[PDB]
Design a protein around this ligand. Sequence first.
Ligand code: HEM
Ligand code: HEM
Ligand SMILES: N=C(Nc1ccc(CCNCc2cccc(NC(=N)c3ccon3)c2)cc1)c1ccon1
Ligand SMILES: N=C(Nc1ccc(CCNCc2cccc(NC(=N)c3ccon3)c2)cc1)c1ccon1
Ligand SMILES: C[C@H](O)[C@H](O)[C@H]1CNc2nc(N)[nH]c(=O)c2N1
Ligand SMILES: C[C@H](O)[C@H](O)[C@H]1CNc2nc(N)[nH]c(=O)c2N1
Ligand SMILES: [Ca+2]
Ligand SMILES: [Ca+2]
Ligand SMILES: [Ca+2]
Ligand SMILES: [Cl-]
Ligand SMILES: [Cl-]
Ligand SMILES: [Gd]
Ligand SMILES: [Gd]
Ligand SMILES: [Zn+2]
Lengths: 404, 403
Amino acid sequence: KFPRVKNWEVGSITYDTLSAQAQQDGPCTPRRCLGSLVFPRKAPEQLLSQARDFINQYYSSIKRSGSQAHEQRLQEVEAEVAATGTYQLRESELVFGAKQAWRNAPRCVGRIQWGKLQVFDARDCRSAQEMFTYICNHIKYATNRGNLRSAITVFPQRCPGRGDFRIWNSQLVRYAGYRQQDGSVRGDPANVEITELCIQHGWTPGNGRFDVLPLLLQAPDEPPELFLLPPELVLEVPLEHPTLEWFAALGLRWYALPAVSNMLLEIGGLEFPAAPFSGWYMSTEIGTRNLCDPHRYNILEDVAVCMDLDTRTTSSLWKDKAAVEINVAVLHSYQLAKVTIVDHHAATASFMKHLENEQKARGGCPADWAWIVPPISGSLTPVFHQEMVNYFLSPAFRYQPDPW
Amino acid sequence: KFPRVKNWEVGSITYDTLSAQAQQDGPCTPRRCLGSLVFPRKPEQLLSQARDFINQYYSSIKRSGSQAHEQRLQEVEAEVAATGTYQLRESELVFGAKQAWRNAPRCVGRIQWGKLQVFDARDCRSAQEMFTYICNHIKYATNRGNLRSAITVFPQRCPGRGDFRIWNSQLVRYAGYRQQDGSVRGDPANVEITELCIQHGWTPGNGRFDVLPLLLQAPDEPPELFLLPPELVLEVPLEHPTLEWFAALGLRWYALPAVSNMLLEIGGLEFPAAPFSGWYMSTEIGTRNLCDPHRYNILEDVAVCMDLDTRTTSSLWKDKAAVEINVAVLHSYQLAKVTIVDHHAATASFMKHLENEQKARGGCPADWAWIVPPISGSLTPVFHQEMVNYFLSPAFRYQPDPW
Ligand code: HEM
Ligand code: HEM
Ligand SMILES: N=C(Nc1ccc(CCNCc2cccc(NC(=N)c3ccon3)c2)cc1)c1ccon1
Ligand SMILES: N=C(Nc1ccc(CCNCc2cccc(NC(=N)c3ccon3)c2)cc1)c1ccon1
Ligand SMILES: C[C@H](O)[C@H](O)[C@H]1CNc2nc(N)[nH]c(=O)c2N1
Ligand SMILES: C[C@H](O)[C@H](O)[C@H]1CNc2nc(N)[nH]c(=O)c2N1
Ligand SMILES: [Ca+2]
Ligand SMILES: [Ca+2]
Ligand SMILES: [Ca+2]
Ligand SMILES: [Cl-]
Ligand SMILES: [Cl-]
Ligand SMILES: [Gd]
Ligand SMILES: [Gd]
Ligand SMILES: [Zn+2]
């Protein structure tokens, strides 16, 4: 059987036939579900089976399955693997593969956009200095003076006999987190480790709550090299609230461009350890997680006090009221600055449209309910009432160990 | 083999060793996770479940393997040889009811699991006696608004005989009436049972909060219609502490959440009629029942009264209206002196339960999607807690509708 999947708002029913194609295994068993875990995980013949599957996907996408070109590319990959132990993607295959990896990412609510992705081919990159040039070009294109455009830059693939390219930073733009001696943190606690590594590698630190980190860039078989981003390249949004004028005096800001730089991109059995990608923010990422998580900036109580809320009892719902107003400030501030942002209602609505498209196109869509449902207002969004099937398809974005 | 479980707010690590004991199989496989599905499940066997429950029982009272332990085992064997089933002792039933609550992965209120009043109704015959047992349960559990958790256990399923069943999904439900513009006056969830009460001879109301009659079914008989005495059904009119117009919306909800359509399984025995009640968490009423698009769906009405900008989602009018409805629910129950818990207090208590259960049993089955509240998810501590979901017995299970 194929899993039956129900939308409880509408009563509609589908069957996820795509999940039967899932190859790599997740952490669940019939005995117990581990769907809530953040980390679900941790050769010529196996390489070829993955390469063949990918080539088949490519020729399907362009409606040329079983063509002469399809058969000849399969044979051509077979011969390169037999000769050299590996192979190279065509340019067209790289573009398709990166879009597919995005399409396949189960925790991404933004996948209505998956076919609109600018793919920068950096597979000729030969040094950390040239890496930095590719990255600056990526940031300039993607930022586009606030009219954000999705993009990925793909650095050379992993290969035996040479180290990996790696970007040590988790995102291209991140705020420093200065671990204080009391155990407290000035800045973003999520970035304490990379801040200390930047210092250890010669960066002169600041002492602000929103200090932009330098990049630690690793070329093959080299220690990371420190590069500072041009200030003119890093677009930031000061946070203000449309009706609470004192909010501006909190001195809060966030950056325009979310650009994840520490995930591994896998295409047809080839691995790209350095392949940063960027899109635009959903406002709850900044307003709810980044600013209100107890272990991040943790501003909820400060705002609630300023709002004159009764923070002495849970039943006043002061936390909920303060969080709503912080999210309003984020949205208002980005819209005022003319920087692309999407609220969680519009994002989840577009994701429901994506599920319907993917049901027609492929018979299902891998989706991680706990990550698709926003961190506030969950059941006020349509995805809350939509059952979802989580599984791993390739091409894929994957977690990888930190390189230090 | 023992899953590692992390809290991402605090960094602490535990290992769930209890999941190794999971008796039945869930819907997930290494190929694909089906954790988000509401319904995960579509002689000699009775004895083995019966045996292992008796073993559980004696271990929990520190009488493991001793003298009375062997006597009870041999009694159940002789019982099933003669009759094809067996009888629980009253204390085994109490223990099994509490364990089934303690084991329920989707219940955020399990800090309370050790405090449960068990009404033994296994001597019941006829719907008229069911109705009397149910009325006594409601009166006890409501307790003038100082709610007390209770379960009434009706006779078990046996071979060659029908079941007792409560056709209603809860003891207190609001009617849902269809109209010729497609829509529903009342609760859309209860349209089916509303027309069943009408079919079996109930004169319907015309309100949005008409309390339904009870449809009680004794074995091998049609169900019988019973009216709940109005003074037995404690309701709470909803008002807001500062929005004076909120009262004029005419919203109400009832005090006692009393689930009456789930099956209780203990030692291989099955009780298809075993209603249980606790008290509400505020988001159940204010977010799910009142704001779900397929329930009362009042969110846009409240937002319009609040003069919010409903033409763009980016004003967050839905979020603001939701918070004030939840405020109204909390204020109204507290003013009426009816027990209620807000989602912040409830999730903090469930974290304490997780710590207690780690020490007691080495883990605790928990369904993240149902434990995290439907508003302000990440503002509660359970959001950042990884959880392991698995099926233990004794258990509460879904069952087919009697029709
Ligand atoms: C264009 C607008 C986009 C929006 C609004 C969006 C939104 C999101 C959000 C809210 C998450 C959850 C992240 C978290 O909670 O940390 C996510 C995850 C993810 N996104 Fe998207 N995204 C967008 C574009 C992209 C693009 C262009 C890519 C890759 C080409 C991408 C790939 C991913 C991946 C791989 C994850 C999973 C991360 C993980 O598992 O930790 N997204 N996205
Ligand atoms: C005393 C206060 C209690 C509170 C605050 C509470 C809270 C909750 C909540 C919020 C849910 C989610 C239900 C939904 O969203 O539809 C739930 C589920 C559940 N509760 Fe509790 N509960 C309480 C008492 C009890 C008792 C006394 C029992 C049984 C003896 C029980 C057994 C269950 C079961 C079996 C479920 C699973 C429901 C399902 O899977 O459909 N609960 N509880
Ligand atoms: N578990 C650890 N932390 C940990 C693990 C996983 C995560 C997931 C964070 N994803 C950041 C992210 C990913 C994808 C999309 C967005 N958002 C966009 N809008 C966007 C970004 C690019 O395009 N669009 C944001 C975060 C922290 C850990 C601790 C030590 O080591 N690891
Ligand atoms: N199966 C159908 N829907 C369906 C299926 C499952 C559910 C789950 C709802 N559980 C109700 C419930 C269960 C447990 C606790 C509470 N709350 C308490 N606080 C409480 C109650 C008693 O003690 N404490 C509420 C709801 C609807 C269906 C389809 C067609 O028709 N019906
Ligand atoms: C324990 C839990 O899996 C973890 O906190 C998850 C829950 N869902 C999430 N969902 C999103 N979008 N982002 C997250 O970081 C998380 N964290
Ligand atoms: C699709 C999804 O599983 C479904 O809507 C679930 C999600 N989580 C829930 N959580 C609670 N507490 N109650 C529910 O009814 C649900 N519904
Ligand atoms: Ca070549
Ligand atoms: Ca008509
Ligand atoms: Ca207006
Ligand atoms: Cl982020
Ligand atoms: Cl309810
Ligand atoms: Gd003001
Ligand atoms: Gd007015
Ligand atoms: Zn699972």
